[PDB]
């Protein structure tokens with residue numbers, strides 16, 4: 056008889072001993088956020104379908120407009136009609152409602168405030184004094200259980216804790232000056248150093264974003280995307296599940312930072328800013344890094360978004376997990392073969408960055424992310440084909456042989472999506488039991 | 500199968516709310532939360548304050564005394580603190596307990612000034628005429644979007660203006676948040692022949708073309724509500740209010756980007772229970788709540804008003820009225836004796852009730868009086884209701900994303916056949 060799937064048992068079987076799994080060498084240095092393909096001058100500008108050179112997202116806009124007018128849901132993908140094409144882009148656009156400029160990357164701006172003091176919720180609750188009263192709990196075991204329970208309330212499908220490895224914190228963030236209003240933000244972006252100093256609280260000066268030396272821990276959350284929608288990549292419905300999950304990320308950060316603050320600690324939100332989420336997720340045990348460059352989780356494969364919160368709250372670090380992803384990616388290469396831009400390498404991992412967009416000095420598969428971004432204006436979306444085709448994105452990968460869990464080696468249209476299965480937040484009740492949590496799952 | 504149950508209990512079309520000739524639209528300031536006769540309550544020291552400040556004083560007293568609720572010892576002070584920290588954090592995306600001020604803060608009646616609208620402006624989705632006017636296809640699209648936006652239940656009704664507040668509680672537009680509670684005002688909500696929802700110095704104006712209301716149910720966590728009137732019931736209440744706010748904003752933006760207008764509301768604009776009953780989410784009950792088949796009354800409500808053409812859902816009758824006629828459990832367990840044990844009438848018990856509709860008449864000033872005494876939002880009635888079926892064990896026990904329960908989550912799966 057088939058053994059009932061047990062996601063907790065799977066995670067226990069593949070748990071590692073303590074220690075960051077990322078292999079580094081001496082040339083590793085912290086990475087300036089401006090170097091990402093989204094922001095760097097060498098990659099920021101892309102032609103639209105008329106050959107006009109524009110900021111990449113404006114060229115992508117031109118393609119969305121063209122597709123709606125032509126009744127298409129993606130590149131050379133006809134929709135049922137113009138109304139369906141329109142609906143997919145309306146859903147995508149709406150999904151981003153709680154996200155600033157595609158990722159919330161500006162630290163201590165807008166939703167990503169490093170202090171709760173000015174928030175309407177903090178002001179309303181000020182008479183109770185929860186943000187002023189010293190912590191009543193300092194035991195890391197109890198704090199880990201409390202904060203993980205809160206994380207699940209706040210919309211995380213996965214949550215893990217690691218010691219903060221500063222190698223993955225950006226050396227300088229992309230941000231805007233404090234007096235710049237939103238409508239000028241994309242014109243007034245600047246770099247600002249992120250530094251660690253002996254100070255009591257996270258603070259921003261004119262010159263620096265200062266994280267306290269007491270900022271010991273990072274809490275990493277996984278926000279599950281919708282499988283049916285992502286499997287339409289590179290078309291519009293994959294864009295929509297991406298977009299909605301960015302707003303879920305923002306809610307998570309704000310909810311959890313407020314909880315931590317009301318417990319008597321400080322908390323720094325981040326979403327896509329501050330540091331490299333995949334590295335934190337690997338160190339916090341959510342999953343393993345992969346050929347495509349994403350964190351692959353046992354529950355969702357790479358079809359999951361990441362956000363993280365930094366804190367001085369005492370916590371128990373989770374153990375890394377090794378469920379064989381590295382060895383599978385070594386012989387799989389499906390994402391590399393299916394990538395429409397040939398951005399993903401078919402070669403071995405190296406320590407040497409492929410271009411300015413990669414951080415050298417850590418052993419990883421080196422992908423050309425300027426090629427990736429170049430496909431987004433061409434397709435009018437955020438692609439995602441690599442996530443969509445990855446065997447680990449399939450819901451059907453885990454089997455039990457009578458002794459232990461293992462990966463099934465056999466694993467290696469949009470109208471129907473609109474007319475088909477959906478549930479709250481795009482979660483899937485056929486698999487939602489996999490993320491149930493009791494105290495034993497939160498702290499050991 | 501929940502889809503089969505709901506089809507089995509579908510009624511013929513027609514509002515199931517019985518009214519008479521005396522029914523008039525209700526001024527929002529009359530609720531116990533806001534009315535001057537109910538607003539001020541003593542704290543445990545005998546100091547008269549705004550009721551929520553007196554309740555704050557009780558939360559502080561409980562933390563210092565290591566309690567999770569009235570006469571309910573916590574495991575230790577740390578556990579007491581954690582429950583209140585979770586409650587306070589849950590409210591992060593909600594203004595002044597319910598987002599009631601229309602066209603303020605998160606509840607904007609136009610998307611034009613939102614950061615997301617400005618970012619997306621070159622696509623022109625909010626300025627392009629609708630490409631779909633077919634109510635069937637629109638109902639399927641908007642219900643799919645509603646589920647993406649966090650609704651566990653969604654229904655559509657024609658807008659019955661009897662349940663829209665005659666006058667809203669709001670603040671002047673240029674008043675900063677810091678002075679909001681001190682400068683609340685009343686403002687009429689009126690329906691006129693105008694293209695778009697609009698606010699003047701004198702009126703909140705809803706277009707006469709605003710045909711429909713979309714009602715969402717946002718499920719609370721059962722284990723946490725079972726701790727009522729203690730702190731963890733407060734926490735699941737609070738988190739769902741922030742879920743409500745995000746739902747309203749997400750769905751309003753979707754509707755706007757489809758070429759229509761959309762008015763969010765959360766706890767403002769009109770009476771959610773009446774809308775939910777007319778939209779088929781559930782039936783009204785003795786306690787006054789909308790009882791749903793999936794969650795009983797343990798579900799929060801929000802709603803969005805729109806001119807988007809839609810197919811109204813049918814009201815449902817699964818026997819709630821006949822059950823509450825004999826049950827009376829909420830009324831016997833209510834710590835304030837707010838809930839009547841008598842029959843339904845058309846006559847309100849006090850200013851806080853809207854007369855003219857056949858309902859169980861409850862004393863809602865008695866209910867609110869228990870909140871400063873208990874330091875929370877009670878909820879004992881929701882907790883004890885048959886349809887709904889210690890704190891250390893809750894913190895150490897089962898949880899899942901947003902507090903949803905995988906044992907039951909299949910019941911809210913949705914395919915096109917059950918959307919339209």
Ligand SMILES: Oc1cccc(Br)c1
Pocket residue numbers: 112157158297327437
């Ligand atoms: O960080 C991301 C992911 C997907 C789309 C966009 Br724009 C930004």
Ligand SMILES: Oc1cccc(Br)c1
Pocket residue numbers: 178179180181182549680681
């Ligand atoms: O009306 C008031 C006075 C003081 C604090 C708060 Br919160 C509200």
Ligand SMILES: Oc1cccc(Br)c1
Pocket residue numbers: 551596597736766876
């Ligand atoms: O509408 C509500 C519900 C619960 C608490 C408070 Br304050 C307001």
Ligand SMILES: Oc1cccc(Br)c1
Pocket residue numbers: 241242617618619620621
């Ligand atoms: O930098 C720009 C210019 C015009 C529109 C948008 Br969105 C961004």
Ligand code: SF4
Pocket residue numbers: 345346347348383384385387388389390391444445446447
């Ligand atoms: S598609 Fe294959 S090679 Fe690529 S990330 Fe997934 S398992 Fe690894």
Ligand code: SF4
Pocket residue numbers: 393394395396397398399426427428430437438439440441442
């Ligand atoms: S998102 Fe698309 S273009 Fe980018 S790496 Fe993945 S498959 Fe290639």
Ligand code: SF4
Pocket residue numbers: 832833834835836837838865866867869876877878879880881
């Ligand atoms: S919330 Fe509590 S006091 Fe209010 S009606 Fe329900 S049981 Fe009674």
Ligand code: SF4
Pocket residue numbers: 784785786787822823824826827828829830883884885886
């Ligand atoms: S407890 Fe009984 S009388 Fe009260 S609302 Fe529930 S079913 Fe009705």
